[PDB]
Amino acid sequence: SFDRPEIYSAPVLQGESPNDDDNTEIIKSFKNFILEFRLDSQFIYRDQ
Amino acid sequence: HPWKLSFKGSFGAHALSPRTLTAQHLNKLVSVEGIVTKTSLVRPKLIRSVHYAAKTGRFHYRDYTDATTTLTTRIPTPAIYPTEDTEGNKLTTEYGYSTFIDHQRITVQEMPEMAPAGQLPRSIDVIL
Amino acid sequence: PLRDLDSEHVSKIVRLSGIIISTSVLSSRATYLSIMCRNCRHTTSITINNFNNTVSLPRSCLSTIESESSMANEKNCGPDPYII
Amino acid sequence: GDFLGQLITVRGIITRVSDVKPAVEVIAYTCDQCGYEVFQEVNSRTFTPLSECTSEECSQNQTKGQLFMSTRASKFS
């Protein structure tokens, strides 16, 4: 009697990545929004 | 702890040949003698599994039964060997404290001195 | 305005404004839950996000789909066995 | 059959020795699209190759990859 097998991985080679503006691409764009928007003398949603 | 018995004793009721035993006196107690032949291999049997969960740091408890020991036809409830029990901690298996009991099955041919002159012998099986 | 909502406005971001009549009485949906196979003793867990008919309980005990030998070696939970 | 899991000491006669051949333990899997490496541990007698990808980045996306194993990155015994 054994236990269950397991699956794990990690991305290493950054290859085969065209800017197709899709599933993973759109998600990274909003990290550039909430932390990295700032209006005049104030950033709001990060402080919200 | 079972504390089993013997039932020693001579009785002229059911000391018949195994050659003439079949289809009669089923679900009774029969005394059979004869020849020990083609002894199988000795295997242990799994009863009680022990599992350690990593993060909670506790053990568990799980048993398994079969229809051979109990002598009464009870409702069979099979249980799959456990993995990922409550929340998602890995059920790491252990041993040693998991209990085990040996097991054996053999066949018994009838007596050649009791047998007739020449015919095909027929036999049954006994699990120990 | 609420008067003109064509079929070209189906499943699109449309805003409006009006008058609310009356509410309802609050019911409850579920998101996270632990289940059990009433024969196999098989437990998983199900999360949902877009709860807005969509999903229901499956109809196989699911212990048969297992990448382990000794568990798949050891029947029928069937029919739909899952009790929350 | 009560000595299971213990540490023991036996003696006898070496009889019918087999040959030494490598035993595969874990298998590497190159993504070729997301660029990760998938690892599958096998403790059974037999096993199976797995699906097209199981990355986190190939996941939540329309076009998943299609993998294949590798020899030099695996661990044997």
Swiss-Prot record, chain A:
Transmembrane segments annotated in the record for this chain: none
Residue ranges of the region described as Disordered: 1-21
Entry's localization field: Nucleus
Purpose: Acts as a component of the MCM2-7 complex (MCM complex) which is the putative replicative helicase essential for 'once per cell cycle' DNA replication initiation and elongation in eukaryotic cells. The active ATPase sites in the MCM2-7 ring are formed through the interaction surfaces of two neighboring subunits such that a critical structure of a conserved arginine finger motif is provided in trans relative to the ATP-binding site of the Walker A box of the adjacent subunit.
Note: Present with 10300 molecules/cell in log phase SD medium. Early fractionation of eukaryotic MCM proteins yielded a variety of dimeric, trimeric and tetrameric complexes with unclear biological significance. The MCM2-7 hexamer is the proposed physiological active complex.
Subunit (UniProt): Component of the MCM2-7 complex. The complex forms a toroidal hexameric ring with the proposed subunit order MCM2-MCM6-MCM4-MCM7-MCM3-MCM5; loaded onto DNA, forms a head-head double hexamer. Interacts with CSM1.
Family recorded in the similarity comment: Belongs to the MCM family.
Name of the protein this chain belongs to: Minichromosome maintenance protein 5
Organism: Saccharomyces cerevisiae (strain ATCC 204508 / S288c) (Baker's yeast)
Span covered, complete protein: 2 to 49 of 775
UniProtKB/Swiss-Prot annotation, chain B:
Superkingdom per UniProt: Eukaryota
Gene: MCM3
Shown part of the complete sequence: 151 to 278 of 971
Family the entry assigns: Belongs to the MCM family.
Compartments, as annotated in UniProt: Nucleus
Miscellaneous remark of the record: Present with 35100 molecules/cell in log phase SD medium. Early fractionation of eukaryotic MCM proteins yielded a variety of dimeric, trimeric and tetrameric complexes with unclear biological significance. The MCM2-7 hexamer is the proposed physiological active complex.
Full protein name: DNA replication licensing factor MCM3
Reported function: Acts as a component of the MCM2-7 complex (MCM complex) which is the putative replicative helicase essential for 'once per cell cycle' DNA replication initiation and elongation in eukaryotic cells. The active ATPase sites in the MCM2-7 ring are formed through the interaction surfaces of two neighboring subunits such that a critical structure of a conserved arginine finger motif is provided in trans relative to the ATP-binding site of the Walker A box of the adjacent subunit. The six ATPase active sites, however, are likely to contribute differentially to the complex helicase activity.
Binding partners and assembly: Component of the MCM2-7 complex. The complex forms a toroidal hexameric ring with the proposed subunit order MCM2-MCM6-MCM4-MCM7-MCM3-MCM5; loaded onto DNA, forms a head-head double hexamer. Interacts with CSM1.
Swiss-Prot record, chain D:
Function: Acts as a component of the MCM2-7 complex (MCM complex) which is the putative replicative helicase essential for 'once per cell cycle' DNA replication initiation and elongation in eukaryotic cells. Core component of CDC45-MCM-GINS (CMG) helicase, the molecular machine that unwinds template DNA during replication, and around which the replisome is built.
Species in which this protein is naturally found: Saccharomyces cerevisiae (strain ATCC 204508 / S288c) (Baker's yeast)
Localization, UniProt: Cytoplasm; Nucleus
Other facts: Present with 166 molecules/cell in log phase SD medium.
Family stated for the protein in its record: Belongs to the MCM family.
Subunit and interaction comment: Component of the MCM2-7 complex. The complex forms a toroidal hexameric ring with the proposed subunit order MCM2-MCM6-MCM4-MCM7-MCM3-MCM5; loaded onto DNA, forms a head-head double hexamer. Interacts with CSM1 and MCM10.
Record protein name field: DNA replication licensing factor MCM7
Transmembrane segment boundaries: none
